[PDB]
Amino acid sequence: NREEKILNREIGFAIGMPVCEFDMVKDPEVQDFRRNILNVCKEAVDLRDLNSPHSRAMYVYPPNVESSPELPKHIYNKLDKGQIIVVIWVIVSPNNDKQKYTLKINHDCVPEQVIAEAIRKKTRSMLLSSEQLKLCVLEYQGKYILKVCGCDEYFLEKYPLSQYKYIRSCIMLGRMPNLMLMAKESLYSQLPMDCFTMPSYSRTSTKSLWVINSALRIKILCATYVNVNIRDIDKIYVRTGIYHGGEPLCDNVNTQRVPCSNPRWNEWLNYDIYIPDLPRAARLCLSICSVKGRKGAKEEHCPLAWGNINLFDYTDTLVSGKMALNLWPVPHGLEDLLNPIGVTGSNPNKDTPCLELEFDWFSSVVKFPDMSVIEEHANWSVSREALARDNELRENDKEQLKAISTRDPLSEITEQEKDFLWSHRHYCVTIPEILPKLLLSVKWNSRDEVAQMYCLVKDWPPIKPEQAMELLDCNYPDPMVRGFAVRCLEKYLTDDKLSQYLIQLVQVLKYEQYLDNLLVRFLLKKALTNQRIGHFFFWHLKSEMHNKTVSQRFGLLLESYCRACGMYLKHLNRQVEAMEKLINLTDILKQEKKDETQKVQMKFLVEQMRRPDFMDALQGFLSPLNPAHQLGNLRLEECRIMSSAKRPLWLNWENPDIMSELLFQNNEIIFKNGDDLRQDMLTLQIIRIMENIWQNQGLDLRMLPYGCLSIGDCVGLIEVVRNSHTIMQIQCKGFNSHTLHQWLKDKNKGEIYDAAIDLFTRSCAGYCVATFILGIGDRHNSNIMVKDDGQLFHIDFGHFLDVLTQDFLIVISKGAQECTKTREFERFQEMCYKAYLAIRQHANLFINLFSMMLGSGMPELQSFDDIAYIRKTLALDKTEQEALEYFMKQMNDAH
Numbered sequence: 081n082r083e084e085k086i087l088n089r090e091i092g093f094a095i096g097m098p099v100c101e102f103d104m105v106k107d108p109e110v111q112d113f114r115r116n117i118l119n120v121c122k123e124a125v126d127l128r129d130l131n132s133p134h135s136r137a138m139y140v141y142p143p144n145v146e147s148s149p150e151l152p153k154h155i156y157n158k159l160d161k162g163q164i165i166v167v168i169w170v171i172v173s174p175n176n177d178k179q180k181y182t183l184k185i186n187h188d189c190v191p192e193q194v195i196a197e198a199i200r201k202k203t204r205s206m207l208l209s210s211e212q213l214k215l216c217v218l219e220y221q222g223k224y225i226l227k228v229c230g231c232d233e234y235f236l237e238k239y240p241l242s243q244y245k246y247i248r249s250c251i252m253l254g255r256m257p258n259l260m261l262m263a264k265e266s267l268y269s270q271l272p273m274d275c276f277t278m279p280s281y282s283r284t285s286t287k288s289l290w291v292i293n294s295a296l297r298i299k300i301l302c303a304t305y306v307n308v309n310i311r312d313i314d315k316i317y318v319r320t321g322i323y324h325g326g327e328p329l330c331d332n333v334n335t336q337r338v339p340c341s342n343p344r345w346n347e348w349l350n351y352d353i354y355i356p357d358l359p360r361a362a363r364l365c366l367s368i369c370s371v372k373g374r375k376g377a378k379e380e381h382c383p384l385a386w387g388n389i390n391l392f393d394y395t396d397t398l399v400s401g402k403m404a405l406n407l408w409p410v411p412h413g414l415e416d417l418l419n420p421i422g423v424t425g426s427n428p429n430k431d432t433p434c435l436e437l438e439f440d441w442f443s444s445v446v447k448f449p450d451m452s453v454i455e456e457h458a459n460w461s462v463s464r465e466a467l468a469r470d471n472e473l474r475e476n477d478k479e480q481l482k483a484i485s486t487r488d489p490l491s492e493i494t495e496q497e498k499d500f501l502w503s504h505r506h507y508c509v510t511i512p513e514i515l516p517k518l519l520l521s522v523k524w525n526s527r528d529e530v531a532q533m534y535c536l537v538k539d540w541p542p543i544k545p546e547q548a549m550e551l552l553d554c555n556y557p558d559p560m561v562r563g564f565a566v567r568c569l570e571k572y573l574t575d576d577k578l579s580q581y582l583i584q585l586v587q588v589l590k591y592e593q594y595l596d597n598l599l600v601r602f603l604l605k606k607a608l609t610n611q612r613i614g615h616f617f618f619w620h621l622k623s624e625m626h627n628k629t630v631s632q633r634f635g636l637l638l639e640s641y642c643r644a645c646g647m648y649l650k651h652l653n654r655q656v657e658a659m660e661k662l663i664n665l666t667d668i669l670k671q672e673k674k675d676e677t678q679k680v681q682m683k684f685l686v687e688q689m690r691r692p693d694f695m696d697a698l699q700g701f702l703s704p705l706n707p708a709h710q711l712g713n714l715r716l717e718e719c720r721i722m723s724s725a726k727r728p729l730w731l732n733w734e735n736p737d738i739m740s741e742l743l744f745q746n747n748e749i750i751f752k753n754g755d756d757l758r759q760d761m762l763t764l765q766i767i768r769i770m771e772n773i774w775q776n777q778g779l780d781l782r783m784l785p786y787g788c789l790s791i792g793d794c795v796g797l798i799e800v801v802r803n804s805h806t807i808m809q810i811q812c813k814g815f816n817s818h819t820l821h822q823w824l825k826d827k828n829k830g831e832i833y834d835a836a837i838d839l840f841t842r843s844c845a846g847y848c849v850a851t852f853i854l855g856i857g858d859r860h861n862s863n864i865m866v867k868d869d870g871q872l873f874h875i876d877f878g879h880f881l882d883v884l885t886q887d888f889l890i891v892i893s894k895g896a897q898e899c900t901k902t903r904e905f906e907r908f909q910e911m912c913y914k915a916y917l918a919i920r921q922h923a924n925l926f927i928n929l930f931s932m933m934l935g936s937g938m939p940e941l942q943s944f945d946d947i948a949y950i951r952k953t954l955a956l957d958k959t960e961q962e963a964l965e966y967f968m969k970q971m972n973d974a975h
């Protein structure tokens with residue numbers, strides 16, 4: 081068909097990988113995933129056509145609302161008697177004139193009641209009685225929608241107006257909302273039909289695992305493509321282990337050593353486990369190792385290549401017969417000989433070290449037992465032997481179980497406690513937050529001990545998403561656990577929180593055993609029913625496509641997404657093209673013209689930016705940082721190479737929106753090629769979570785988690801904060817330690833003075849507690865910035881996990897000379913003390929978020945010691961008073 085071939089290449093352009101290359105893969109799991117995932121695409125497309133045209137606009141322009149309509153009390157007090165002033169704009173088609181209309185309404189009106197008060201005010205002197213304020217008001221509030229002035233963000237749903245993020249921040253930032261009436265038909269007329277078509281690539285005995293009573297053995301035949309130095313390497317062998325999510329189910333078993341010239345073994349390795357006792361997520365982890373002989377020094381075993389296999393395939397079949405596994409290059413850092421956390425499957429580069437294996441064939445297909453059999457074997461032998469009144473808990477015992485629940489992902493559960501948790505597993509359903517710890521108590525190489533945990537999980541009470549995510553990290557491989565976790569996310573995870581957590585959730589996809597699973601079908605369905613989520617879903621996947629360990633998985637997931645995302649694929653292709661130009665341009669500035677004057681680089685830049693193909697690709701597309709922002713014409717006179725390390729580009733676009741003057745008229749984005757911005761995305765994620773934790777508890781410590789998006793390999797975008805300056809720029813205007821204070825006095829004269837100091841004090845207090853916990857390094861005068869209104873914020877988070885200068889406390893003390901002894905300083909301290917204890921209450925959240933990214937390859941997130949720094953700064957090994965004591969110490973150390 082013709083219309084399928086044009087879509088195949090547009091999907092390929094967006095992914096960067098030809099779709100035909102996916103037709104050439106013969107792995108039945110790959111072709112079954114490609115075919116079976118389309119059920120999520122039809123479910124999503126069907127959802128978009130339910131209440132069309134509204135449901136279709138809901139997909140393209142979903143409500144950008146907070147997780148809850150409830151307002152913190154100090155935010156409601158910012159309102160007048162619970163009401164908000166709102167300016168509503170109407171465009172009068174003759175002259176396209178902008179008529180304004182200022183309203184005052186309850187913060188909890190839904191959009192259509194705000195539309196009502198707008199027309200009652202548009203005709204407020206039009207001689208209309210009560211019998212005429214129902215002919216025009218009742219008809220128009222069904223024909224109009226509210227749009228944010230200056231961007232493509234709409235209020236298409238009956239949420240409380242103040243629950244919309246744009247309105248929530250206007251309430252908190254003291255600004256006034258500017259909205260605009262739009263005819264429903266004006267918006268609906270701009271939504272295509274998105275006719276999703278099913279692609280053309282759609283359309284003997286079995287025995288139980290538990291009857292195959294016999295020990296496990298695996299044959300290691302030979303290895304090809306093993307290129308080593310014959311002059312120094314002595315022998316070669318295959319190291320092997322059976323692992324369940326990074327934990328060994330039995331002792332590792334090497335092969336015999338052979339000369340590095342003849343890598344053949346023809347050996348059956350036997351393992352200390354029984355085949356019925358293999359868990360569902362059982363994995364074979366092997367690697368080829370060299371041995372070098374040294375006089376006086378011990379032999380050194382260096383791994384040469386690694387690989388992991390699933391003992392069961394995606395159809396629950398215990399694997400039998402011969403197979404060839406292509407292995408992977410050794411990660412710089414892996415100091416063991418096996419890589420159990422590495423992805424599973426044969427390296428797609430088939431010209432790499434290849435290991436041939438063989439599994440036993442037990443006369444027929446062997447499959448894992450279904451829940452029916454598991455239940456029967458669980459209810460049976462649950463009390464094979466059976467002091468039943470002693471396992472009854474006492475107040476001391478129950479509490480201990482709760483104390484174990486408070487522990488973070490990195491805590492160690494002693495063997496004493498693991499047998500405690502397991503024996504009292506029938507009580508644990510009363511405290512569902514113990515489930516992560518109770519799951520680690522299982523001896524997963526025991527089908528009886530596992531069949532019973534499957535039974536407690538089948539009817540386990542749901543838990544909060546922040547804890548359900550813990551069960552999705554790589555140390556919980558079992559599909560029953562991960563299905564429970566995903567079910568908890570489907571029921572309790574709002575869209576707002578999903579968006580904030582999407583980085584970790586896409587990252588953890590790479591640890592999943594199989595292509596088709598409940599997490600990927602959850603994430604895909606939400607990406608295909610909410611285009612704002614689908615947009616970042618796309619870029620978190622695309623930006624990782626260069627990693628060969630995941631590029632096949634993410635390439636297939638992107639294929640299914642691009643087939644069903646609708647007309648947005650064209651917009652994404654415009655963003656992909658625009659970014660490739662910037663990637664190819666800044667790569668020249670980093671290779672060829674790297675040592676030339678900025679004069680020479682700019683001339684090359686202006687000249688290249690003036691070519692026809694370039695101006696077409698980089699004008700008239702959506703900002704990857706926020707697709708609600710349209711990037712129109714590129715105002716080249718304001719573009720410049722900056723004076724930072726990687727020579728980032730300062731790019732300036734006109735905002736083509738009609739109301740641009742009410743939000744921002746020029747959109748400025750920093751394109752940076754050279755630094756892993758995933759590392760900065762994670763920091764700004766945390767800073768945003770710390771702000772929400774503080775607001776919901778009464779601390780208006782205003783942070784600035786500015787936008788930041790990784791689009792590829794050490795390439796990405798950074799939102800420019802407007803009306804802000806670094807301390808370098810402030811101090812150079814007039815150095816003295818009172819230049820900062822004097823600069824804010826000039827910018828905040830009169831009544832605004834005390835507001836600027838308060839804003840600077842609350843924002844400064846937020847950033848001292850955050851930068852201390854997170855260990856932000858390299859804190860010099862260009863990394864801290866101040867806004868004209870006094871808001872302080874940091875800006876370079878390329879260093880974390882291993883700062884109160886004088887002229888900061890001068891601003892807090894309102895210019896006093898004994899800054900360490902003023903009362904204004906006493907409030908600064910108590911804000912920090914309260915802010916520290918609020919974060920410490922959520923240590924599990926912030927530790928989980930790092931732990932899930934530990935395998936992502938971030939330069940400064942390489943080991944548990946990096947994460948343990950937060951276990952130290954948060955003082956999780958002490959009491960609250962002893963922890964607040966700790967924080968007080970470095971506060972006194974900080975000048």
Ligand SMILES: CCN1CCN(c2ccc(Nc3cc(Nc4cccc5c4N(C(C)=O)CC5)ccn3)cc2)CC1
Nearest residue numbers: 421489490491553554555931932933934935942943944
């Ligand atoms: C102290 C142990 N205790 C503490 C709790 N614990 C635990 C295990 C795993 C994870 N999560 C994880 C871990 C991931 N990698 C790794 C897992 C295990 C070791 C290392 C990993 N490294 C990298 C670079 O890859 C560094 C070395 C990737 C994604 N997620 C979280 C906690 C095990 C028992």
